[PDB]
Design a protein around this ligand. Structure first.
Ligand SMILES: CCCCCCCC/C=C/CCCCCCCC(=O)O[C@@H](COC(=O)CCCCCCCCCCCCCCC)COP(=O)([O-])OCC[N+](C)(C)C
Ligand SMILES: CCCCCCCC/C=C\CCCCCCCC(=O)O[C@@H](COC(=O)CCCCCCCCCCCCCCC)COP(=O)([O-])OCC[N+](C)(C)C
Ligand SMILES: CCCCCCCC/C=C\CCCCCCCC(=O)O[C@@H](COC(=O)CCCCCCCCCCCCCCC)COP(=O)([O-])OCC[N+](C)(C)C
Ligand SMILES: CCCCCCCC/C=C\CCCCCCCC(=O)O[C@@H](COC(=O)CCCCCCCCCCCCCCC)COP(=O)([O-])OCC[N+](C)(C)C
Ligand SMILES: CCCCCCCC/C=C\CCCCCCCC(=O)O[C@@H](COC(=O)CCCCCCCCCCCCCCC)COP(=O)([O-])OCC[N+](C)(C)C
Ligand SMILES: CCCCCCCC/C=C\CCCCCCCC(=O)O[C@@H](COC(=O)CCCCCCCCCCCCCCC)COP(=O)([O-])OCC[N+](C)(C)C
Ligand SMILES: CCCCCCCC/C=C\CCCCCCCC(=O)O[C@@H](COC(=O)CCCCCCCCCCCCCCC)COP(=O)([O-])OCC[N+](C)(C)C
Lengths: 610, 70
C-alpha cells in the first residue's frame, strides 16, 4: 500500500491518488512516511516535477487537514546521514515552484528549518552545494527574489539565523558570490535587498565560527564585487542611512567629496579588511581588490606619512651595513677608531637575524606556496645574518674556514640590496620581472643546459686516451671536470678552440663538439632570449599590480613595526555621518566626473570645501 | 598558445601506449560503476562527471535519481 502511493506521486496522477487514499484512510499515524530516510509522501512528489504536481499536493494537504494531523506532515525532516534537515520547503524552493512554496508556507511549513546534512555542507566543493542551510538562504542563492520577499515578511522567519558553520544569509551570499563571467550580479542585488529589508546592523556585525564578518569574509574569500559594493555602499533614502558606508559630504558641480567609513577597514581593529586583503595569499584576484576606493587611498596616505621614511631609513642602514662589512672584510690584516665598524656589523647582523627569526617563526606555510614571490627575501636576509654571525663565531677561535662565510655574506648582502628597488616604481617593475624571469625560463634553460653539458662532457672525456711519458698538457679535455669546464668556457665564448687533442677518434670528437655548439649556442641560448621576450610581454601589464602588492606588504609591515605609541596617525577626522554617537572614522575622497549631471540630494554639508 | 594541446596529445599517446603495455589481466581498472540508464539489461559502463553553472536556473525534469550524491 505504501509503495503504491509512493510510486504514483512521481507520475502525477490526479484521479488514482484519491482512489488510493480513500481505502488507505479507511484501513485504520505512521502511514505516509518512508522508514529508511524519512521521505514523506508530501515531499516525495516535489522532486518529480509534473504538470499535475500542484493538484496532488493540494489533495495531500487537504487530506492532512481533514484528519487533524498537519504538524508532523509538513514539518517532516529527513533521516539519512547525508540529509539531516532537508524538508518539503527546501526542495520546493529549489524546484522554482513559488506557488507550491507559498502553499506550503501558508500551511505552516518550517521556515527556520536547518538543512544541516553532510551533502549540504561540502568539503571539496565537488560533491555538494553550500547555500546557507536555510530555505531563505537557498532562495537568495538560487536567484529567486520573489521567494525571498515572500519569506522575509512572516511571523516566525529568523533572518539572523546562524547555521552549523556560524554563517548567516549575508555570509552565505558572500561565499556563493562569484565574478560576472561565471554568474550574474544577482547576489549583490540579493545582498542589498535583504540588508535593506532587515534594516539593522546586526547582520553585518555578526561573526561566524571563524572570527569574520561578512565584510571580512568577502575580503578573505576574494569576492571583489561584493567588497566593492559594501565599501562604497551609499543609501539615498533617509529612513535607513546609518547602514551606508560612504557618505557624500558635498558635491559642487562635477566635484564631490565623499566620506568613507573605516570601522573594520583601517588596520586598527586586529583583523581588518586592509590587512586581510594584503597579507592573505590563497586568492588570485588580490591585485584588483586593492584598487577599491578606501583601501587604495589608505595605502597611499600611509606610504606618504610614515612608510616612506621608514623604507628610506631601512635602505640607508642596510646600505651602510653592507658598505662597512665589505670594508672591514676586504681590508683585513691578512684599530680603535675602526673597531666601531665591525662592532656595528655584529650588532646589525644580530638585529637582522632576530628580526627574520621572529618573522619566520610566525610565517604561514601558505605564503611559502607559489614560487617564492613573497618570502624569498626573508630567507636570504636571515641567511646573510647567520653567515655574518658564523663568520665572527669562527673568527673568534682558531678556525681557518671563516673567510668563506664572510665572503659569501658580502656577495649575498650586495645581492640582497636589490630588494630595496621596490621603493621606486620603475626599479620595482625591474625587480619583479627579474623574479618571474629567473624562476620561469632561466631554471628550465639551466636544467636542459646542465643535462647537455654533463652528457657531452662525459662523452668527450671518454674519447681521449692517457697522456704519454713526459707529457701532461696533451688535451684540455682530460678528466670529466676538465671536459665540463672546457664546454662551459666554450659556451661563454672564452678561450681558444683547439681540435688537436689526444683523441683516438678526432672526427667523432669534432662531431660531438659541433653538436654541443649547435644545441647550446644556436638553439638553447637563443631560444631563451626568445622566450623571456614572451615573459616580459605578459608581465609588462602584470607589473603595476604585483609591485603595488609588495609595496602594500612593506607598508603594513612597517606599520606593525611601530610601537603602541607613535601610531596615532589615523586617516582623517572623526565626524562621518549624522549618527549622534560613535562617529568612528572617515576618509575624504574627491571625485570628478562630467557625465552624470544630476541634482545632488544625498549631500551632507551645504558649504563645500573646508 | 599551441602548447597546452600538443603536449596533452603526447600525454594521451603515452597513456594509451602504457595501457596497451598492460597484460590481459591487471587491466580490470575500468572507469566507473556499471549502472548507466533505466534499461533493464546490459547497463554497460558509465562515467560520473559533475558540472557547476549559475546561469540556467531551470526546473530539473530529466533527473534520474531523487537522492543526490553518493
Ligand atoms: C650558458 C652557460 C652559463 C652557466 C650555466 C650553468 C653552468 C654550470 C656548470 C659549471 C661547471 C663549470 C666547471 C666546474 C669545475 C670543474 C673543475 C674543478 O675545479 O672541479 C672541482 C669541482 O667544481 C665544482 O664543483 C664547482 C662548484 C660548483 C659548480 C656549479 C655552480 C653553480 C652555481 C649556481 C648558483 C645558483 C644560480 C645562480 C642564479 C640564481 C673539483 O675541485 P677542484 O677545484 O678541482 O679541487 C678540489 C679541492 N681540493 C683540492 C681541496 C680537494
Ligand atoms: C633563485 C632566484 C633568486 C631571485 C628571486 O627569488 O628574486 C628576488 C628578486 O630578485 C632580485 O631583485 C635580485 C635578487 C638578488 C640576486 C639573486 C641571485 C642570488 C645571488 C647570490 C650570490 C651568491 C651568494 C650565494 C649564497 C647561497 C625575490 O623578489 P620577490 O619575490 O619579488 O620579493 C618578495 C619577498 N618579500 C615580500 C619578503 C620582500
Ligand atoms: C609580522 C612582522 C612583525 C614584525 C615586528 C617586529 C618587532 C617590532 C618591534 C620593534 C622593532 C623596532 C624597529 C627595529 C629596528 C631594527 C630592525 C632592522 O633590522 O631594521 C628594520 C628597519 O626598521 C626601521 O627602519 C626602524 C624604525 C623604528 C621605528 C621608528 C619609525 C620612525 C618613523 C618616523 C616618520 C616621521 C627592518 O627593516 P625591513 O624593511 O623590515 O628589512 C627588510 C628585510 N626583509 C624584507 C626581509 C624584512
Ligand atoms: C642611489 C643608489 C645608491 C647605491 C645603491 C646600491 C645598491 C642598489 C640598491 C638600491 C638602490 C635603488 C633603490 C633605492 C631605494 C631607496 C630609496 C627610496 O625608497 O626612496 C623612496 C622614499 O625615499 C624618499 O624619498 C625619502 C624621503 C625623506 C625621508 C626622510 C627620513 C628622515 C622614494 O619613493 P618614490 O616612489 O620616489 O616616492 C613617491 C612619490 N613620487 C612618485 C611623487 C615621487
Ligand atoms: C637551485 C635551484 C632550484 C630551485 C627550485 C625552485 C622551483 C621553482 C619552479 C618554478 O619556478 O616553476 C617554473 C617552471 O620550472 C620548472 O619547470 C623547473 C624544472 C626544474 C629546474 C629547477 C632548477 C634547476 C637548476 C639547475 C639544476 C614556472 O613554470 P610555469 O609554467 O610558470 O608553472 C606555472 C605555475 N607556477 C607559476 C605557480 C609555478
Ligand atoms: C644539480 C644536480 C645536477 C648535476 C650535478 C652533477 C651530477 C654528477 C656529479 C658527478 C661529479 C663527480 O665527482 O664526478 C666525478 C666522476 O663522475 C662521473 O664521471 C659521473 C658521470 C655521470 C654523471 C654526470 C654525467 C651525466 C649527468 C646527467 C644529468 C644529471 C642531472 C642534471 C639535472 C639538471 C669526477 O671525475 P673526474 O673529474 O675525472 O675526477 C678526477 C679523478 N679521476 C680521474 C681519478 C676520476
Ligand atoms: C654510428 C656508426 C659508427 C660510427 C663510428 C665510425 C667509426 C669511427 O670512429 O669513425 C670516425 C668517427 O665516426 C664518424 O665519422 C661519425 C660521424 C657522425 C655519426 C652520426 C651522424 C648522424 C673517426 O674515425 P678515425 O679513427 O678518425 O678514422 C676512421 C678510420 N677509417 C676511415 C679507416 C675507418
Amino acid at each position: 500500500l505504501k509503495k503504491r502511493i509512493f510510486a504514483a506521486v512521481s507520475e502525477g496522477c490526479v484521479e488514482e491518488l484519491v482512489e488510493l487514499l480513500v481505502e488507505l484512510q479507511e484501513l485504520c499515524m505512521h502511514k505516509l512516511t518512508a522508514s529508511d530516510t524519512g521521505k514523506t509522501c508530501l515531499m516525495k512528489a516535489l522532486l518529480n516535477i509534473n504538470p499535475n504536481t500542484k493538484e496532488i499536493v493540494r489533495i495531500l494537504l487537504a487530506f492532512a487537514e481533514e484528519n487533524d494531523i498537519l504538524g508532523r506532515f509538513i514539518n517532516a525532516e529527513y533521516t539519512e546521514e547525508a540529509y539531516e534537515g532537508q524538508t518539503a520547503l527546501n526542495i520546493a524552493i529549489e524546484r522554482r515552484q513559488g506557488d507550491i512554496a507559498a502553499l506550503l508556507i501558508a500551511a505552516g511549513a518550517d521556515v527556520n528549518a536547518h538543512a544541516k546534512g553532510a551533502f549540504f555542507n561540502p568539503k571539496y566543493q565537488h560533491e555538494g552545494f553550500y547555500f546557507g542551510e536555510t530555505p531563505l538562504a537557498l532562495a537568495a542563492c538560487t536567484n529567486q527574489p520573489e521567494i525571498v520577499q515572500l519569506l522575509m515578511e512572516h511571523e516566525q522567519t529568523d533572518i539572523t539565523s546562524r547555521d552549523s558553520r556560524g554563517n548567516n544569509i549575508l555570509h552565505a551570499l558572500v561565499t556563493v558570490a562569484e565574478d560576472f563571467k561565471t554568474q550574474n550580479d544577482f547576489v549583490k542585488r540579493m545582498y542589498d535587498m535583504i540588508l535593506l529589508r532587515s534594516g539593522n546592523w546586526e547582520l553585518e556585525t555578526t561573526r561566524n565560527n571563524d572570527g569574520l564578518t561578512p565584510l571580512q569574509l568577502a575580503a578573505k574569500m576574494g569576492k571583489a564585487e561584493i567588497l566593492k559594493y559594501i565599501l562604497s555602499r551609499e543609501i539615498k533614502e533617509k529612513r535607513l542611512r546609518s547602514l551606508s558606508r560612504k557618505f557624500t559630504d558635498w558635491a559642487y558641480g562635477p566635484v564631490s567629496s565623499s566620506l568613507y567609513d573605516l570601522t573594520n577597514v583601517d588596520t586598527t581593529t586586529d583583523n581588518s579588511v586592509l590587512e586581510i586583503t594584503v597579507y592573505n595569499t590563497n586568492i588570485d584576484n588580490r591585485h584588483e581588490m586593492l584598487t577599491l576606493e578606501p583601501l587604495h587611498t589608505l595605502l597611499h596616505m600611509k606610504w606618504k606619512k610614515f612608510a616612506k621614511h621608514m623604507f628610506f631609513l631601512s635602505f640607508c642602514f642596510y646600505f651602510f651595513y653592507n658598505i662597512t662589512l665589505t670594508l672591514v672584510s676586504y681590508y683585513r690584516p691578512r684599530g680603535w677608531l675602526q673597531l666601531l665598524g665591525r662592532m656595528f656589523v655584529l650588532i646589525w647582523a644580530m638585529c637582522i637575524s632576530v628580526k627574520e627569526g621572529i618573522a619566520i617563526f610566525l610565517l604561514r606555510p601558505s605564503d611559502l606556496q607559489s614560487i617564492l614571490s613573497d618570502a624569498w627575501f626573508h630567507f636570504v636576509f636571515f641567511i646573510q645574518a647567520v653567515l655574518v654571525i658564523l663568520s665572527v663565531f669562527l673568527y673568534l677561535f682558531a678556525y681557518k674556514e671563516y673567510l668563506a662565510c664572510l665572503v659569501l655574506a658580502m656577495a649575498l648582502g650586495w645581492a640582497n640590496m636589490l630588494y630595496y628597488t621596490r621603493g621606486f616604481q620603475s626599479m620595482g617593475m625591474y625587480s619583479v620581472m627579474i623574479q618571474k624571469v629567473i624562476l620561469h625560463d632561466v631554471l628550465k634553460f639551466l636544467f636542459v643546459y646542465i643535462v647537455f653539458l654533463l652528457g657531452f662532457g662525459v662523452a668527450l672525456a671518454s674519447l681521449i686516451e692517457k697522456c704519454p711519458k713526459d707529457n701532461k698538457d696533451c688535451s684540455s679535455y682530460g678528466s670529466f671536470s676538465d671536459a665540463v669546464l672546457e664546454l662551459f668556457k666554450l659556451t661563454i665564448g672564452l678561450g681558444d678552440l683547439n681540435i688537436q687533442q689526444n683523441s683516438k677518434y678526432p672526427i667523432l670528437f669534432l662531431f660531438l663538439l659541433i653538436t654541443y655548439v649547435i644545441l647550446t649556442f644556436v638553439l638553447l641560448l637563443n631560444m631563451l632570449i626568445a622566450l623571456m621576450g614572451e615573459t616580459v610581454e605578459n608581465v609588462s601589464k602584470e607589473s603595476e599590480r604585483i609591485w603595488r602588492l609588495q609595496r602594500a606588504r612593506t607598508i603594513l609591515e612597517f606599520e606593525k613595526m611601530l610601537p603602541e605609541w607613535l601610531r596615532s596617525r589615523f586617516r582623517m577626522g572623526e565626524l562621518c555621518k549624522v549618527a549622534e554617537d560613535d562617529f568612528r572614522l572617515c576618509l575624504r575622497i574627491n571625485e570628478v566626473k562630467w557625465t552624470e549631471w544630476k541634482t545632488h540630494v544625498s549631500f551632507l554639508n551645504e558649504d563645500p570645501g573646508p
